[PDB]
């Protein structure tokens, strides 16, 4: 049994991480302007 509140806060940060990687990619990728 894994406490729910931990499943969330872990899956939570995990999303802020991936979605944040996207936001970084906006200043480096092909979607850049440089």
């Amino acid at each position: 049994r894994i406490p729910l509140w931990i499943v969330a806060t872990v899956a939570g940060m995990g999303v802020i991480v991936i979605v944040g990687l996207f936001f970084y990619g906006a200043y480096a990728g092909l979607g850049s302007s440089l």
């Binding site: 931990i6 806060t9 940060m13």
Partner: peptide, 28 residues
């Protein structure tokens, strides 16, 4: 270069100071 090292720790710090409390069970 990769100060993501910083964030990571101070990031898991927040949930930790309540997790240790779920262990030592008390005052939440």
């Amino acid at each position: 270069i990769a100060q993501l090292t910083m964030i990571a720790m101070i990031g898991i710090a927040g949930p930790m100071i309540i997790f240790l409390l779920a262990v030592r069970r008390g005052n939440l």
